[PDB]
């Protein structure tokens, strides 16, 4: 549920996902790239299904990071879409789209696709 | 399909020349807008060779590796979508363009997009 999503997560490439899940469906927090210093922290916001349908069902969620902070700006934004699965080995399985600002001529190269799995910190 | 078989054009000016085998094979040539011989690439794919139902599309996909005798872009695109028959025949697709990368750069190896093909230039 919400106590389950709220916390600190890490993906397979070393990034950190620090999130609070609200009772109203809000996701808010900080995304930290693998370098882990101050210039590596970005704001994230998103939403999740705060009343999932069964107990064996995953919890649908989504969030966005625009890759601008006080130090750097990559003129791009990533959205992650996926599900939280609780239990012993709780996980967040996602697919993501990374879009860069481009000219109309280069829009074909604007959007990368991938996937990330996050596991929680003990 | 002798419906699918033919010459198709996407929004950008690219041309898709395909034979649909009776069994479900797609074979042909993808020609980039530039037109000339260095712009022609081999394609192969598959489609659902069942007869079409009541106003439902026919599933298909195909691949192009962007190497020919002139050029090698070290990359391959797959298009997945469906064929809609009738008078205003259309192939609506989503595509994935993957580039060969080192393992450090694999995370940015695959672009996603969409294309729509018709038989009208």
């Amino acid at each position: 549920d919400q106590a389950g999503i709220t916390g600190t997560w890490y993906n397979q490439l070393g990034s950190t996902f620090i999130v609070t899940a609200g009772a109203d469906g809000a996701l808010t927090g900080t995304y930290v790239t693998a370098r882990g210093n101050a210039e590596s922290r970005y704001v994230l916001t998103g939403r999740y299904d705060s009343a999932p349908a069964t107990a064996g069902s995953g919890t649908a969620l989504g969030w966005t990071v625009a890759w601008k902070n006080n130090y750097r700006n990559a003129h791009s934004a990533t959205t992650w879409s996926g599900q939280y699965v609780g239990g012993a080995e709780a996980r967040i399985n996602t697919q993501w789209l990374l879009t860069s600002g481009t000219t109309e001529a280069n829009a074909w190269r604007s959007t990368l696709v991938g996937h990330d799995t996050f596991t929680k910190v003990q | 399909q002798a419906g699918i078989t033919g010459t198709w054009y996407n929004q950008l000016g690219s041309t898709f020349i395909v034979t649909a085998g009776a069994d479900g094979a797609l074979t042909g040539t993808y020609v980039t807008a530039r037109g000339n011989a260095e712009s022609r690439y081999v394609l192969t794919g598959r489609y659902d060779s069942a007869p079409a139902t009541a106003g439902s599309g026919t599933a298909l996909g195909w691949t192009v590796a962007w190497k020919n005798n002139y050029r090698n872009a070290h990359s391959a695109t797959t298009w997945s979508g469906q064929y809609v028959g009738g008078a205003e025949a259309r192939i609506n697709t989503q595509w994935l363009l993957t580039s060969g990368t080192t393992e450090a750069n694999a995370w940015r190896s695959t672009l996603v997009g969409h294309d729509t093909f018709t038989k009208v230039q």
Binding site: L13, G14, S15, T33, A34, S40, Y42, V65, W67, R72, A74, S76, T78, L98 | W107, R108
Partner: peptide, 4 residues
């Protein structure tokens, strides 16, 4: 890219 920062995401890595």
């Amino acid at each position: 890219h920062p995401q890595f």
